[PDB]
Every structure is written in C-alpha cells, then in structure tokens.
C-alpha cells in the first residue's frame, strides 16, 4: 500500500532564484581521480600501463 | 736501432695559413652516442635506467 502525509511525502525543494545560490561546497561533496580530456593519447597511456606492470 | 731517412720519418705537415681551411669531413669521422650536457639530472638518468631494465 502507498501512503499519503507528513510522515510519507518528502518537503520539495523550491527553485533557486536567478539571484539565489546553491551554496554547495563541491571539495566536500567529491576528489577527482581522472580527467578524461589529456594530453596524452591511448597509446602513451596504454604504453605507461605496461611500464607500470613493468616496474 | 734507430733509422734516419725517407723510408723512416714522417713528412711534416705544414700549418694551415689563417685563410686555408683542414678540409675534414666530421660525420665521415665520428657518430656521437652521448652529450655529456643534458636537460636530464642524474636520478632522472638513474631512474630511466631503473625502468629500462623492467621493461
């Protein structure tokens, strides 16, 4: 059964202002670990993996 | 013994004036394998050595 109330329901969240900002903290919330657009191509990548198994 | 004569000694060769030029082709004479003054620093060498032998 779906139920319907205060206790059920989730408050919805009312659209920001143009003027309005978020206020989200992005460090907080993630850290990178690969950017997808290098200088490097496939090839100096896959070439720096087999001398990382190298090693 | 010692000899004197055509058949022995050499014959000198003169010094070149200031506008006569040796005429000596370097690359007929010598291919270089190593310039001692690099970019690199030794532990990079050193480093670089490391990773060749792993490969």
Same mark, same amino acid.
């Given at each position: 059964?779906?139920? @319907? =109330?205060?206790?059920?329901? !989730?408050?919805?969240? #009312?659209? &920001? $202002? /143009? =003027? /309005? /900002?978020? =206020?989200? #903290? *992005?460090?907080? &919330? /993630?850290? *990178? @670990?690969?950017? !997808?657009?290098?200088?490097?191509?496939? $090839? *100096?990548?896959? *070439?720096? &993996?087999? @001398? !990382?198994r190298? @090693?």
């Amino acid at each position: 059964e779906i139920r @319907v =109330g205060n206790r059920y329901q !989730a408050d919805i969240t #009312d659209l &920001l $202002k /143009e =003027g /309005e /900002e978020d =206020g989200r #903290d *992005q460090s907080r &919330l /993630e850290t *990178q @670990v690969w950017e !997808a657009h290098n200088p490097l191509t496939d $090839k *100096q990548i896959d *070439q720096f &993996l087999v @001398v !990382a198994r190298s @090693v």
